[PDB]
Design a protein around this nucleic acid. Structure first.
Lengths: 180, 152, 41, 114, 94, 135, 125, 52
RNA sequence: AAAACUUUCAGCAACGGAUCUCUUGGCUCUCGCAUCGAUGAAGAACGCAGCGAAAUGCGAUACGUAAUGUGAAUUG
RNA sequence: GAAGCUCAGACGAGUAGGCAGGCGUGGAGGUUUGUGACGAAGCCUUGGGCGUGAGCCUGGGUCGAACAGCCUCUAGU
RNA sequence: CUGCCGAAGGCAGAAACUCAGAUCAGUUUUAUGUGUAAAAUGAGAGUU
RNA sequence: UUUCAAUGGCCCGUCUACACGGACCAAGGAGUCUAGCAUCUAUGCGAGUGUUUGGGUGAUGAAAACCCAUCCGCGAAAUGAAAGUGAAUGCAGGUGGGAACGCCCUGGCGUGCACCAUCGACCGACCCGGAAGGGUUUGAGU
RNA sequence: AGCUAAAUAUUGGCGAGAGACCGAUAGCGAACAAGUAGAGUGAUCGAAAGAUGAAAAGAACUUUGAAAAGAGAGUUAAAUAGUACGUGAAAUUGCUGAAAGGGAAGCAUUGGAAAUCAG
């Protein structure tokens, strides 16, 4: 059994046409939805930022948009993800805020901009999200002045201590519980 | 840098001129260009191969030893012209060829991007030289200037 | 088994030869060259 | 680029005037002096040379070699075989004298043709 | 190419990547080296080997006397006071 | 051996030039260059700009204006943060090494310019890169 | 050069289509040009060949012969013309066939259908 | 110029691309071999094709 | 020691169907599509034309009828 | 044809094995203002010529529609 | 197809570099008893 | 070309003399494709290198070509059973040879690449000491 | 306890576009009246076979012959295209011409004799 790749240009052309057909069908709105900024879950990749599946309920509520209408206006919602730190919270919150600020909603039934809509909608144009919302990387630290207490601070001497504390943590954990 | 004149639609020479691009000074490398062109020319090929069942969909087993005849398998049955004839062999008529051609032969070949750009730069530099054009075979005896530049 | 030689009217057989019954083996005088090799082996 | 790189791409193998055979190759160049493959005789692969065809004489120089239209200059001779020998040799005295004999001999053979 | 084979003439014949301090200044761009190296500035340049894909920094090479802050998870034993004798400090990143 | 295995036209021209120089001069340096031009890439290891700078400024040094010659590639060494005033003539320079040499210091030359400046090899140090380095 | 993908360029497919075309398609394939006066009169370059049309042979051994068409013998892409025949061995007349594209139509057979064809193909009556 | 770039500045339409450098710069060996700097150093030229 | 016979050579004529050229075929790859049947399927049988055995088409309305388009044939 | 020219000397069995240079076949890219119904390919020949050889060119006859040299590529060679 | 090298009962060849050597020899002398050591003749010898 | 005269000439392949194949002719017919590894050669770049998993452009045929992007692969650091630790003292150490070069005035002098003999230090794993220091153990290590 | 497009597969079916593929002992078994002729109780097995010419213009008519055919003609550029039809090789056979031959024949070297070509 062998799997040959003689249809690689054909697959590439078909995917491009499918993207083109998708764009033509839903032209008023961007062809890619808004995605949250999310950090990979490992020690090898926790220094980067990538695109998550969707926002969380806490982020949606903090931004002020309900989880019901969020799907309608094009904001994917993830019910599994949870925010364990405010740093991620206001990070995804400001992603939604800039999305909403740049967002224009065509009024339904074309009678009046009922509450949340756009008065002038003639400026419709299909633009990708990445241009308006360019996902970034972790902020690289710029040059800072020398810190004196850090200068006195050795470095890995500490990592040796808390390491030895960690390895023999059960050793003294026993010691206290047995003598108490 | 040397400058080349612009020739108009009426065949005249205009006052505007272009400085010679750096690419026209690229090292002309015929051997590298030929090797890259050899590789690149094979990337538009379509695969070909015989049927994988060709030469096998008959029914023929060896008659055995001591038969006063070759031990190649022969089609069974009778009353037909094919009965008693050999099969399953590159020598045999209507038999499978030796090492049947396969579709997963290496049809395409990978060339380094820098090597490709080296060849293209040398090709442009070669195109900017009159003598190479004459060897190429282009009848450019009365071409006013090489490289030839025409207005927009 | 009974031994017979495939020569003349005994060539080109697919099955039991003519006038032969019981356990049978037929030789064609060509297998002597690979039988002598087996004897050495 | 230069004379020698043009030679090593063109002169050795690749040329619309090469005729290879069993062990020999010849020159169809309307510019060549000897009809053979050489550094001394290929005007594509070297600087200014001169040649004769049926009689009009081609001449070259370097400062305008970037302009093919006016690159080859033609002078016409229709007077005499002996006379043509004087114009050919006179205009090659101040020019490298190696190929004066070959050019003169071409004049003689081609006048014999006429 | 089959034509240049041997049979055509046989016819008829039967996770923790590491970096040494010699390469620490290489990580900073050319602009940072030009505007911080070889001169005296109150603010010191910072090197984040973690953002460059390095887990630990090891101790092969010398350093110019220009102070520099090294952000890393693990640091080598005498590579620390290689920074300190060079005038910088290793500030450990989490 | 009397010809390189490469088909490179410019390598052939360099072989042609130093073949004449070796056979028409008494320069054992020219004979060495011709021999090293015939050597293959496995016998032509690249030499680092750090090694060249070390060899020039080695012990008593006396580097002065002596031209450094290697039949090979002068690869760059990012590990040293300064480049001295150097003048190296070589077969091929990497873009990083060439830029570092020219921007801060001296000049680079081809073996052509070497034959133009020191055709007999006078005041030329003939360096070679480290062999083995097998992987 | 063709730039579409709905049309073919293979010799195999073109010949198969040509020699396997039904009678309705062979009608279009069996077209002939018009004479200079006819062309300047109807603004039509070419027309399909129909029986009882007055034509003149332009190429072949009958170059210059003129007559009307007795039948458009479609299944061999052939025409039959009055008096353009051959003497057999016995002496009977065997009609000599001429290709439709080798003749020129010097006089048409006008009916309402053909006039509709003329006005439809960018022409005037 | 913007497509291929030079040997020193990058091409604008090809990122991190520089025109390749050359092994030999003034590769016209014939003028180079007949230049004065080499004729002045070469020993007395040996004879060409000789009598038998 | 001439004929005949045998053999060799050459011309011609036979036998045979190689080679060369072709090719409505095959093979391979890619692209597009989703559509059998108790409202009787796939398959089999037997028939149908002015003169038909096979191939194709069709079913006692039988080398087919109706409808639409073409516009003057079919052909031995 | 610097991949060339030139002078001189020695040497010459050859299996296993190693190295090098060439002849021929189908198809592809480039080139030859390439050949061809005033006759391409093929075929026959007691004709002629070339090469140590693989092979190549050619005269005559037949024949009827395509074919070849040069540089690369490729292989059901 | 041709040419060159060419065995074996650890070999022949290829590449990388020593010294213009007293460096080796299917050898003979000299000395000590077929071993060893230090004149003849021949050869460019070699090392991984 | 045929033929004669003189001289010479055992029937080819296979297999260890024999034996096995061979009536004749035409056509077909047997070290191929592919995955990995290794040596060598060539090309590009070079402490970097690799576009074609993917995206964009490509209209003139668009399965080609060209362009763009983060991972990631190999390399840039080795050792230890494992936690782990994890490299120029001394011009990134010296000595001798050593290619090439220079200097004179054949030789000598410098001068020293690569590489080879040495050689000390450093990284470790092993041992002693409580990091310094001591081993003349070790790794196709700096 | 349950549903759900998309990216994914697709030697079958239906359409197409191609090809550095094969060129009638090849390519599918089948370019053709091919799963046909034919073989086997049966499951099954399973071939061979393409080319006149632009157009049959497929040889009227006469003669010999029982007829088949042949010989004259006639069509055609061609019958060295006559259906047993493009080109038409070898093995093998017949005729003619030349030559040799007492239990082998083949081949090589030198030269004569005959034939032939060439400078």
């Amino acid at each position: 059994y062998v799997k040959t790749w003689f249809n690689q240009p054909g697959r590439k052309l078909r995917r491009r046409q499918a993207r083109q057909t998708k764009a033509a069908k839903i032209a008023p709105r961007p062809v890619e939805a808004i995605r949250p900024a999310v950090k990979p879950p490992t020690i090898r990749y926790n220094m980067k930022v990538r695109a998550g599946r969707g926002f969380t309920l806490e982020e949606l509520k903090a931004a002020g948009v309900s989880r019901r209408v969020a799907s309608t206006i094009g904001i994917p919602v993830d019910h599994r993800r949870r925010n364990r730190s405010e740093e991620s919270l206001q990070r995804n919150v400001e992603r939604i805020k800039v999305y909403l600020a740049h967002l224009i909603v065509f009024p339904r039934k074309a009678g009046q901009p009922k509450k949340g809509d756009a008065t002038d909608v003639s400026g419709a144009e299909q633009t990708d999200v990445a241009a308006v919302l360019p996902i970034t990387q972790e902020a690289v630290e710029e040059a800072k002045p020398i810190t004196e207490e850090a200068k006195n601070f050795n470095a890995f001497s500490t990592l040796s201590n808390e390491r030895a504390y960690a390895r023999y943590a059960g050793a003294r954990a026993a010691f206290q519980k047995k003598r108490a | 840098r040397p400058t080349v004149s612009i020739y108009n639609k009426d065949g005249s020479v205009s006052s505007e001129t272009l400085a010679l691009p750096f690419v026209f000074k690229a090292p002309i490398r015929p051997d590298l260009v030929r090797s890259v062109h050899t590789a690149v020319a094979k990337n538009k090929r379509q695969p070909y191969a015989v049927s994988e069942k060709a030469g096998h969909q008959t029914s023929a087993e060896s008659w055995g030893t001591g038969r006063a005849l070759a031990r190649i398998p022969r089609v069974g049955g009778g009353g037909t012209h094919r009965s008693g004839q050999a099969a399953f062999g590159n020598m045999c008529r209507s038999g499978r060829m030796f090492a049947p051609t396969k579709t997963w032969r290496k049809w395409h070949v990978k060339v380094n991007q820098n090597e490709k750009r080296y060849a293209i730069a040398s090709a442009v530099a070669a195109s900017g030289v009159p003598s190479l054009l004459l060897a190429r075979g282009h009848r450019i005896e009365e071409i006013p200037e090489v490289p030839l530049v025409v207005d927009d | 088994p009974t031994l017979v030689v495939a020569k003349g009217p005994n060539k080109g057989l697919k099955s039991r030869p003519k006038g032969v019954k019981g356990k049978y083996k037929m030789v064609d005088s060509r297998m002597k060259k690979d039988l002598r090799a087996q004897k050495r082996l | 680029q230069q004379d020698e790189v043009i030679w090593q791409v063109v002169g050795h193998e690749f040329c619309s005037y090469r005729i290879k055979g069993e062990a020999q190759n010849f020159c169809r160049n309307e510019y060549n002096v000897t009809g053979l493959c050489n550094r001394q005789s290929c005007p594509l692969a070297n600087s200014r040379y001169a040649t004769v065809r049926e009689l009009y004489l081609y001449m070259k120089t370097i400062e305008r070699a970037h302009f093919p239209s006016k690159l080859w200059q033609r002078i016409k001779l229709s007077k005499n075989y002996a006379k043509a020998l004087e114009q050919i040799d006179q205009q090659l005295l101040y020019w490298p004298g190696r190929q004066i004999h070959r050019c003169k001999q071409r004049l003689t053979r081609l006048t014999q043709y006429l | 190419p089959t034509h240049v084979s041997k049979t055509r003439k046989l016819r008829g014949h039967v996770w923790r990547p590491t970096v040494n301090l010699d390469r620490l200044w290489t990580l900073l761009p050319n602009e940072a080296r030009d505007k911080y190296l070889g001169k005296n500035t109150e603010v010191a340049p910072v090197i984040n080997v973690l953002q460059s894909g390095y887990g630990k920094v090891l101790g092969k090479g010398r350093l110019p006397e220009t102070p520099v802050i090294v952000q890393t998870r693990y640091v080598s034993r005498r590579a620390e006071e290689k920074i300190k004798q060079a005038g910088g400090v290793v500030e450990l990143i989490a | 051996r009397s010809k390189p295995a490469s088909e490179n036209v410019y390598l052939k021209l360099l072989v042609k030039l130093y073949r004449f120089l070796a056979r028409r001069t008494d320069s054992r340096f020219n004979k060495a260059i011709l021999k090293r031009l015939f050597q293959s890439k496995t016998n032509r290891p690249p030499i680092s700009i750090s090694k060249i700078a070390a060899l020039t400024s080695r012990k008593s040094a006396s580097s002065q204006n002596k031209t450094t010659v290697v039949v090979g590639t002068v690869t760059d060494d990012e590990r040293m943060l300064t480049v001295p005033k150097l003048s190296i003539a070589a077969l091929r320079f990497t873009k990083s090494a060439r830029a570092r040499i020219l921007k801060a210091g001296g000049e680079v030359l081809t073996l052509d310019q070497l034959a133009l400046r020191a055709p007999t090899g006078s005041n030329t140090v003939l360096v070679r890169g480290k062999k083995h380095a097998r992987e | 050069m063709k730039f579409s993908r709905d049309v073919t360029s293979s010799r195999r497919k073109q010949r198969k289509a040509h020699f396997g075309a039904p009678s309705s398609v062979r009608r279009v394939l069996m077209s002939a040009p018009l004479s200079k006066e006819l062309r300047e009169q109807y603004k039509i370059r070419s027309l399909p060949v129909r029986r009882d049309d007055q034509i003149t042979v332009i190429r072949g051994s009958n170059k210059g012969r003129e007559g009307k068409i007795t039948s458009v013998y479609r299944k061999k892409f052939l025409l039959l013309i009055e008096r353009v025949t051959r003497e057999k061995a016995n002496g009977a007349s065997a009609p000599v066939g001429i290709d439709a594209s080798k003749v020129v139509i010097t006089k048409l057979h006008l009916d309402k259908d053909r006039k509709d064809l003329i006005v439809r193909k960018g022409g005037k009556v | 110029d913007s497509v291929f770039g030079s040997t020193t500045e990058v091409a604008q339409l090809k990122k991190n691309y520089f025109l390749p450098e050359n092994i030999i710069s003034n590769a016209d060996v014939t003028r180079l071999i007949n230049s004065d700097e080499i004729q002045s150093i070469v020993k007395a030229a040996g004879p060409s094709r000789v009598k038998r």
